[PDB]
Design a protein around this ligand. Structure first.
Ligand SMILES: Cc1cc2nc3c(=O)[nH]c(=O)nc-3n(C[C@H](O)[C@H](O)[C@H](O)COP(=O)(O)OP(=O)(O)OC[C@H]3O[C@@H](n4cnc5c(N)ncnc54)[C@H](O)[C@@H]3O)c2cc1C
Ligand SMILES: Cc1cc2nc3c(=O)[nH]c(=O)nc-3n(C[C@H](O)[C@H](O)[C@H](O)COP(=O)(O)OP(=O)(O)OC[C@H]3O[C@@H](n4cnc5c(N)ncnc54)[C@H](O)[C@@H]3O)c2cc1C
Ligand SMILES: COc1nc2ccccc2nc1CCC(=O)O
Ligand SMILES: COc1nc2ccccc2nc1CCC(=O)O
Ligand SMILES: [Cl-]
Ligand SMILES: [Cl-]
Ligand SMILES: [Cl-]
Ligand SMILES: [Cl-]
Ligand SMILES: [K+]
Ligand SMILES: [K+]
Ligand SMILES: [K+]
Ligand SMILES: [K+]
Lengths: 589, 590
């Protein structure tokens, strides 16, 4: 069962060397290639279970079983003697560039997955193109290379979150003996946005150069797949040309949804517009209850905003709801208001945005609660966070035969492969996968290795940790309590929980018994940890490490036998004893 | 194999119930005991590999193989019919108190290990006493129940560390758009100490109540083992009485050493004195280079102190020295000066401490460098951090026949047992163990279970993670790079490293490529992680989780196959690719 792979590897590899670590002639070929700046895949037969078998099977393609053996785009070019010849003749350099296609890999979308998968392909000799185009938001907002995370996501939102937490640090400082008057300290939104944008601008250029450095051809162009190897590009001048590629990776991501109600698109904004917004939003309504909505509501309120969240049903749908409710209660006792069981019917305009004076406008939101009562209040700014969607109607002609699911997302096999043999899909557009930056990065790299370096390792999308950067952070890894109970049954679920108080909150006179953690375990499987959950400061930092134990199948005994680091929030995970079955209080003393 | 256990368990258990989960009369006995507020051990025979064998073996002690079966201090009390009889007659509270000894357990020392081991013993019906006495420092400083960590260690030092970090928070705030000038903001030492001591006072009281609530007899008394079951106590009035215990746990910990040079004891202080000090130390010398010395130097400097560290040899002896050097370089570019290769010869006094105005005095430190050159500078305050030592009775433990090693520490087996069968030792006095609070707690609890609840689980003292709360924190778990190379050979050691920059430092205009992490792995064992090391903010929070993966034998492949959380410092451990062998640079950029 080796030859299936060898055909797949040889034919799709751009430049590949079948080698050994202990082949003197394999060393000479490697050394030379590096001097000619010729990048390539290297598969070392002496470090594979099936080494013998592959040597004998190469005979099909090369007519010989020796090492080394260099291939270019499916074609055997030779052993060490033949490659050195072409080098001293200078015909080698032009041989490794001979391709049917302009490009070994075209990547449509220069975001988290695209950039990762392009840079990795180029490491193994792939003639690579990244296409990126940021279609503007309704009010005109646009941005540079990087994707959602870099420009309008993880990066700006966490920096603003940090702006938020420093507020409490100013509070905490007086109690820890510092002589500042927190009451006479205000926040300048423009100063903050200047700093955030400055950093994004440098990430934009950083990514431009990363591509240039690794000989990846960046085109600032809308790409459209008109057939399996043809990509139709459209540049800033509307100049429409075609470029050919062997392997196509779709990596186009998603954009914010707007509710289908009058005034939404005209008068309100999304996350896309928030992170470069030139004026303070002022009195703000966030419509939606996802991590984006509460993250944004949280930081706006911490920067002295008047913030209301309108929630259709529940907070953080898809997350453990005990933890979701605790996140919401924190925000509610710390200045964020909620309109529960409420939807928007209409956005009406009272004042237009004053670009002259950097003020926002003024809007009237009409809505209604589930019992039929009316909602009617003024807000300076209205942020929709009611979901994100792909639009491959833009990007793939429906006639190419890439099956999309009911929600517009690409249906892929376990190796990111679409219904077209040479076309792949990664990141937010890959149906069913968790919509996270690190997941788009590991998927994109691991795919590029499989295409261009004969790797077999697939991405593992299971037990992917997360962190919601609400004023009080919520980290998690694996199943919500409710999901564990549905899958294994209540009699098979043991839940260990405890409140805690960060030592930093003691002198600072913050709350006892609001920070909280639990382990959802499975009795019949040695109390296997199915779910880790924590609400407190630096939840991401706390949670991350445990993701490795959970991947490895950590049991409750594994948490117990580990010794804590003192003093930390994290340590309380090493001494949990109170079960939900016991009814004993998780408050601590 | 199993009757050996049953003898050991039944004999040493205070109150124990041989049970099953699906025994209706076992439920009735349990329910009743809980109503009578009678705490006890429960062993469920139907949840053990060896269940059948234990039922048949009870016949030696009880004359029967039924469940349930209740025992008190090695005496069979009865089956369910006999126990429900004794309950309705009210003879039952009587029967569970009968003891040869005043106490099932005396614990000498009410610190991290002692308090943990006493509270746990009482959970399983043990008649328990905790003795705690704080001998005052040379200047007279003293404190409440809780031990070194609570009053003089982890708690006050991290709170002062937090005071330190908020300095940077004030700086970072201006850049994130907040309208304060760091230059017009100073720190009040007394305000800070007031709040820290307030918190310690609440832990002092908290611990006193936790003991009372669990029916543990706290005695504020110097305890002394005069024989294997007899403990001689001496209260604040010098009233010298004796109390008997079945099992004795020594948990007396350590106190600061002073160098044998003139003026050290008279004119200078230690960590014990610092955390309640009524005046800002001002221009300060720390002698020593341990985690205490650099932790204390770091926070003093951050609170506008003029701080110098005198280092005999290297920073953080016993820790990975690449990481130790990087911790020191941070402190050096952030206001801490170092006198390298230097020892103190003399502390001379120029002014006495000004108790009138709560300012310090003034001292002259005379010392010398390893090349022979002189050292002479004025300091307002001089803190010794040159080691801690067991203050254990040095001849008494001999009279009793508890072997101490050459350094004053108790030589124990892997089950915390001393050379006297009924006497145990836990925490910093236990020779060879890591001197850490959570290690003292785990030791104490797991021992109390083994004595009073028939547990067999030992403590695992290996790969116990640490965190040095230097202004830039250093977390670690397992072997230093140099220790791994010495044990396995350099050919077999692969080291993955990378610099990083916290996103929080980007708008804040702090350093690129000073934060640093590495994984020391073993090539011949699937790149098994032998050591994780990290210098950045929240190092303890970062490090903790990985301690569990390493305990379970995490490989590099295990870190790679895990997906990162973005954006965090921790995630950079899920994508390390640069080896030290390759010579490629650790430096990064977005
Ligand atoms: C507000 C917000 C906060 C988030 N916070 C986090 C977080 O903290 N942590 C986390 O892990 N994830 C977070 N995410 C999710 C994360 O941003 C995404 O999972 C990730 O960016 C998606 O990667 P991608 O490459 O699939 O798509 P994207 O990063 O969206 O990249 C797609 C790119 O392709 C462009 N494009 C579209 N069509 C074409 C075309 N035809 N031709 C060329 N280019 C095209 C798009 O405009 C974009 O530049 C957040 C998302 C949002 C919206
Ligand atoms: C400055 C400093 C900072 C530290 N920071 C940390 C940290 O961040 N994290 C960490 O894990 N560890 C830290 N440690 C170490 C930690 O404090 C110790 O490991 C821990 O205190 C050991 O607990 P123990 O029970 O062994 O002894 P202790 O906690 O010291 O308890 C011993 C107690 O017994 C009393 N005693 C002694 N003899 C008698 C007697 N005959 N009768 C009655 N009472 C007696 C003593 O007065 C004392 O109260 C720090 C230590 C210091 C000095
Ligand atoms: C994820 O989007 C939703 N899925 C649902 C599934 C079942 C029931 C309701 C649901 N509501 C939403 C989005 C609206 C909301 O979150 O209230
Ligand atoms: C434990 O203290 C020491 N251990 C050593 C071990 C081996 C060699 C030298 C040593 N010097 C010290 C003394 C403190 C110091 O390191 O400066
Ligand atoms: Cl750009
Ligand atoms: Cl609860
Ligand atoms: Cl500084
Ligand atoms: Cl920070
Ligand atoms: K759009
Ligand atoms: K706590
Ligand atoms: K533990
Ligand atoms: K970084």
């Amino acid at each position: 069962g080796t030859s299936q792979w060898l055909r797949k590897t040889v034919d799709s590899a751009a430049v590949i060397l079948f080698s050994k670590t202990t082949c003197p002639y394999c060393k000479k070929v490697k050394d030379v290639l590096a001097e000619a700046k010729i990048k390539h895949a290297t598969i070392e037969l002496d470090q594979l279970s099936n080494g013998s078998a592959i040597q004998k099977c190469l005979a099909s393609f090369s007519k010989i079983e020796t090492v080394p053996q260099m291939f270019v785009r499916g074609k055997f070019i030779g052993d060490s003697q033949t490659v050195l010849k072409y080098y001293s003749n200078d015909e080698l350099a032009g041989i490794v560039n001979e391709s049917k296609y302009d490009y070994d890999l075209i990547v449509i979308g220069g975001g988290s997955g695209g950039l990762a998968a392009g840079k990795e392909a180029a490491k193994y000799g792939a003639k690579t193109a990244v296409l990126d185009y940021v279609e503007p938001t309704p009010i005109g907002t646009t941005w540079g290379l990087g994707g959602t995370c870099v420009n309008v996501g993880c990066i700006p939102k966490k920096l603003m979150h940090q702006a938020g937490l420093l507020s409490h640090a100013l509070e905490d400082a007086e109690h820890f003996g510092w002589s500042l008057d927190r009451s006479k300290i205000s926040h300048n939104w423009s100063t903050m946005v200047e700093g955030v944008q400055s950093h994004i601008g440098s990430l934009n250029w950083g990514y431009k150069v990363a591509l240039r450095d690794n000989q990846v051809t960046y085109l600032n162009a809308k790409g459209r797949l008109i057939s399996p190897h043809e990509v139709q590009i459209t540049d800033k001048n509307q100049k429409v040309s075609t470029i050919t590629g062997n392997k196509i990776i779709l990596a186009t991501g998603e954009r914010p949804k707007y509710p289908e109600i009058p005034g939404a698109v005209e008068y309100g904004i999304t996350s896309d517009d928030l992170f470069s917004l030139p004026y303070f939003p002022g009195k703000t309504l966030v419509i939606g209850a996802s991590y984006v909505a509460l993250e944004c509501a949280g930081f706006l309120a911490s920067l002295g905003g008047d913030v209301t969240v309108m929630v259709r049903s529940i907070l953080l749908r898809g997350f453990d709801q005990q933890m979701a409710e605790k996140v919401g209660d924190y925000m509610e006792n710390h200045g964020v208001k909620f309109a529960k069981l409420c939807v928007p019917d209409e956005i009406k305009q009272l004042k237009v945005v004053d670009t002259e004076n950097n003020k926002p406008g003024l809007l009237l939101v009409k809505g209604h609660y589930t019992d039929g009562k009316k909602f009617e209040e003024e807000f300076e700014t209205v942020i929709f966070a009611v979901g994100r969607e792909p639009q491959l109607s833009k990007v793939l002609c429906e006639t190419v035969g890439v099956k999309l699911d009911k929600n517009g997302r690409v249906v892929c096999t376990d190796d990111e492969q679409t219904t077209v043999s040479n076309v792949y899909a990664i990141g937010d557009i890959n149906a069913g996968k968790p919509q996270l930056t690190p997941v788009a990065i590991q998927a994109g790299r691991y795919l590029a290795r499989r295409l261009f370096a004969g790797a077999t390792e697939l991405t593992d999308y299971s037990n992917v940790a997360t962190t919601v950067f609400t004023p009080l952070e919520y980290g998690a890894c694996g199943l919500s309590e409710e999901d564990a109970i549905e899958k294994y049954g209540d009699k098979d679920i043991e839940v260990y929980h405890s409140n805690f108080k960060p030592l930093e909150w003691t002198v600072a006179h913050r709350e006892d018994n609001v920070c909280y953690m639990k382990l959802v375990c499975r009795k019949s499987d040695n109390m296997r940890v199915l779910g880790l959950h924590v609400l407190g400061p630096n939840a991401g930092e706390i949670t991350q490490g445990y993701a490795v134990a959970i991947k490895m199948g950590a049991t409750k005994a594994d948490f117990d036998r580990t010794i804590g680091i003192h003093p930390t929030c994290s340590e309380t995970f090493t001494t949990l004893h109170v079960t939900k079955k016991s009814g004993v209080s998780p408050i601590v003393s």
